[PDB]
Write a protein that binds this ligand. Structure first.
Ligand SMILES: [Cu+2]
Length: 99
C-alpha cells in the first residue's frame, strides 16, 4: 500500500486517511505536498504486543523533500492509529486496519 503525505490542494492530511491492508503488507508513506511530515504510531491505539518504537519514525526525524518515503511492514492484526508530529494539532491523523 502507498499513503500520500499531504493533499495536493495543500490539505494537511494523509491520503487516504483510513485504509485496510493485509497482515504482512508493506506501507510506503510518500511525501506529496505541505512537508515536512513524519509518521508516528500512537502507543495507546495499536494492537497488543506491537512495539511503537519499532514502527514509528523518531519524533524529531522529518521527511523534508519532495518524493521522500518511509516504509513499514505491519504484521499484527487490528487497528493502528498514526499521526504526523509537526501537523498533529492541525488534523494530520490517520488509521490503518490490518486484516
Ligand atoms: Cu505533516
Amino acid at each position: 500500500a502507498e499513503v500520500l503525505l499531504g493533499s495536493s490542494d495543500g490539505g494537511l492530511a494523509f491520503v487516504p486517511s483510513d485504509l485496510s491492508i493485509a497482515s504482512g503488507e508493506k506501507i510506503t508513506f510518500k511525501n506529496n505536498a505541505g512537508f515536512p511530515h513524519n509518521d508516528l504510531f500512537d502507543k495507546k491505539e495499536v494492537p497488543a504486543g506491537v512495539d511503537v518504537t519499532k514502527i514509528s519514525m523518531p519524533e524529531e526525524d522529518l521527511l523534508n523533500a519532495p518524493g521522500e518515503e518511509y516504509s513499514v511492514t505491519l504484521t499484527e492484526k487490528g487497528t493502528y492509529k498514526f499521526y504526523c508530529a509537526p501537523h498533529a494539532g492541525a488534523g494530520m491523523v490517520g488509521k490503518v486496519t490490518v486484516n
